[PDB]
Structures are given as structure tokens and as C-alpha cells.
Amino acid sequence: MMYKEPFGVKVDFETGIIEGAKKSVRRLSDMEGYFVDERAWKELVEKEDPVVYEVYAVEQEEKEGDLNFATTVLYPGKVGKEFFFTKGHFHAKLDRAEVYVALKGKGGMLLQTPEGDAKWISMEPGTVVYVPPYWAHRTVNIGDEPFIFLAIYPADAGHDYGTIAEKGFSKIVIEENGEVKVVDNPRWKK
Amino acid sequence: MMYKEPFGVKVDFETGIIEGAKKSVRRLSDMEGYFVDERAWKELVEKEDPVVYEVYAVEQEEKEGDLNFATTVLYPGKVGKEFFFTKGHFHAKLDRAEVYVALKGKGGMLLQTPEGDAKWISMEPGTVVYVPPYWAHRTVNIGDEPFIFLAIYPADAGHDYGTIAEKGFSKIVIEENGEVKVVDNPRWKK
Numbered sequence A, B: 001m002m003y004k005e006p007f008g009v010k011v012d013f014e015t016g017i018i019e020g021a022k023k024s025v026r027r028l029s030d031m032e033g034y035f036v037d038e039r040a041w042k043e044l045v046e047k048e049d050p051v052v053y054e055v056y057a058v059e060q061e062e063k064e065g066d067l068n069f070a071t072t073v074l075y076p077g078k079v080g081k082e083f084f085f086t087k088g089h090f091h092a093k094l095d096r097a098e099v100y101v102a103l104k105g106k107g108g109m110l111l112q113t114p115e116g117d118a119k120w121i122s123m124e125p126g127t128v129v130y131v132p133p134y135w136a137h138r139t140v141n142i143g144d145e146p147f148i149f150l151a152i153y154p155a156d157a158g159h160d161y162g163t164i165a166e167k168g169f170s171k172i173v174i175e176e177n178g179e180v181k182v183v184d185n186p187r188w189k190k
């Protein structure tokens, strides 16, 4: 058998860039049907179509017991009142967990069960977040600078984006009167 | 079914302390039969019996797909010429991986296959280390201050300390003439 080669990689905690990893880019135009204010979404796409987030991932062959890791740089912004976020997903193998480490900026995680119950966990540098089996998860940038974090997750966890793409999360994170709010999603189908 | 509660915990990157986690302490006297210079080991135990390392672990019920994480504070020191290190272990389920994130200080990882081939990966703050399936792993502090890191690993990986307790690693990390060396272990049985 081949024993895979151990390695180290440099991660820059100031930029989130993983040396040699290769950036994946999600622009606002890649996120139709995600934000509550659909007209605000369309206008910002027309005017700018900004980068919402970038991901640097180091991934193994899909195998039980193995581990992937990735950084994300989630840029600051709003679509209407709603802060920039990641698409969010369940695992394909639902019972897989994740562990996140916040590195820079100010943000948080929205989590949701298949039944639709949602939780918010605030994230500042040094916060480690336990993403349990069976929960979907989305990260949100509530500040004025990039929100940067590292995620470690099973190599065989896979992705279910579709469920979230259709239903969204049951809570949204917005700014009103200069204050950040977590509130029920008015468009939540269930 | 119960969906486990998501949570965040504060990790202090300067001290490695995980809030609320509860310290496990490994003193030099807990490591008989680990260092090459057995007389140097015995003398330092008699004179001081220093703390070699402390671990703060956040662990789940042993279940496929779930994740544990832990910090270690590996203190600076030598037993003779040999730098302080962790005991080191294989997983009980051998094909489980780990991911480490170096936070503070200067150190590195020694890895070894069941066949006895060994690898060294240098670790400074920001270095992420991929610990592959089937490898044993030990961390080493090659500097003058605590070496602090975070590890994420499968909840069902388990521990095999016994193999390492009897055979050691095939390489040692020492200081000679003010320079750090990685060299063959003269006492390596195989």
C-alpha cells in the first residue's frame, strides 16, 4: 500500500491565502435566489457584481476517516440590509461534522437542522466552532473588513447545496438602525 | 433524534488555553522509556520532574464522521540532547487522519508508518500540517518558549500508544553544537 505523503503548508492568517492551493471565487451573480431582497441583488449585480467570497481548499480522495481543510475570505457587503454570506449547505453524508477556526474580522455562523431549527454562533478571532452532525451551515460577515476562517471537515462528507438553494435558512442576519440583528426569515418556506 | 447543540469556544492563541476545557498534564515521570538517554531522564525526574506538555481537549461521543479538537502546550526543554516531545501514537482505527494548526513557538512533527519510515515537518505559526491515514505522529519543541498548536481529528480514531511506547520513533530530534538535528535513532528496534 501507499502511505500518503505528510506535508505542511503556510497559511497567512492576515489574508487567508493557503500557499499553492488555487482560489475558487463566488461572485454575487453566482447566488441568484439566495438573498431576501431580490431587486437589491439584481441591482448590485448590474452595478458591480462584487466578489462575495473566495475559498482555498486542500482536499483528499473521498475516503472514510480522512480530512479536508479550507480557508475562506468572506468579503464585507450587504444586499439591501442583508450581510454577505456563503451559499450554505448540508453534507451529502449528513452525519459528518466540521470544525471552524476564526482568524480575522467579525462574523458568525448560521446553522440549521433538517427540521428547520436554526442557531447563530458569533465568531471573532480565536473562536473555534463545532458544526455538529446533521446541521447545515452558512457563514456571515457582519463587519467592514474581510472575515477570514479555516475549516476542517471529513473527506467523504460531500455537499448538498440544493436544499438550501431552494428553501434558504429560517433566519437572516441584517443591519437596521446601525445595529446587527438576527431575525426570522420572512420568506422561509416550511 | 437529538440534534447536538452547536457551540463556539474561545481559544487563546497566546496561551493555548481552551475556555472551560480542563487541562490534562503529562510530566516527565509519565514518560519512562521514551527518551534515548535514560540516565538523563532519571536525573531530570529526580531534580525537577517538569511538565512536558498540557492538553485541552473537546471531544464527542465516539462515532463515525464526527470530530474532536484539542490544543497542546508543549514546554521547552531537553532530556540530554533530545528536545521535549509528546508521547506519540497511532490511531486505533489506523486509516484516520488529523489536521494540525501551529499557533505559537517553534517546533515540528515527526511521523512514522507501520513499516518504520519517518518524516519531519517543520512547524511555525500559521503552518497547517496534514497527518495522513496510517501514520503515527509526535510533536517536538525545538525552541526556548512554549510550542502551542491546535489539532482536529476524527471522534472514532482512538489511540495506540503502546506500539510507540515499546519501539519509539526511527528518528530523534536533538541539539548538538547549538544546531538542531534530525538523525537516526540509535536505539530503533527493527
Ligand SMILES: O=C(O)[C@@H](O)[C@H](O)[C@H](O)COP(=O)(O)O
Residues within 6 Å of the ligand: A055, A070, A071, A072, A086, A087, A088, A089, A098, A137, A138, A139, A151, A152, A153
Ligand atoms: O468547510 C466548509 O464548509 C467551507 O470551506 C465552505 O465550503 C466555504 O466557507 C464556502 O461556503 P459554501 O461551501 O457553503 O459555499
Ligand SMILES: O=C(O)[C@@H](O)[C@H](O)[C@H](O)COP(=O)(O)O
Residues within 6 Å of the ligand: B055, B070, B071, B072, B086, B087, B088, B089, B098, B137, B138, B139, B151, B152, B153
Ligand atoms: O490530536 C492529537 O493527537 C493531539 O491532541 C495529541 O493527543 C496531543 O498533542 C498530545 O500528544 P499524545 O497524545 O501523543 O501524548
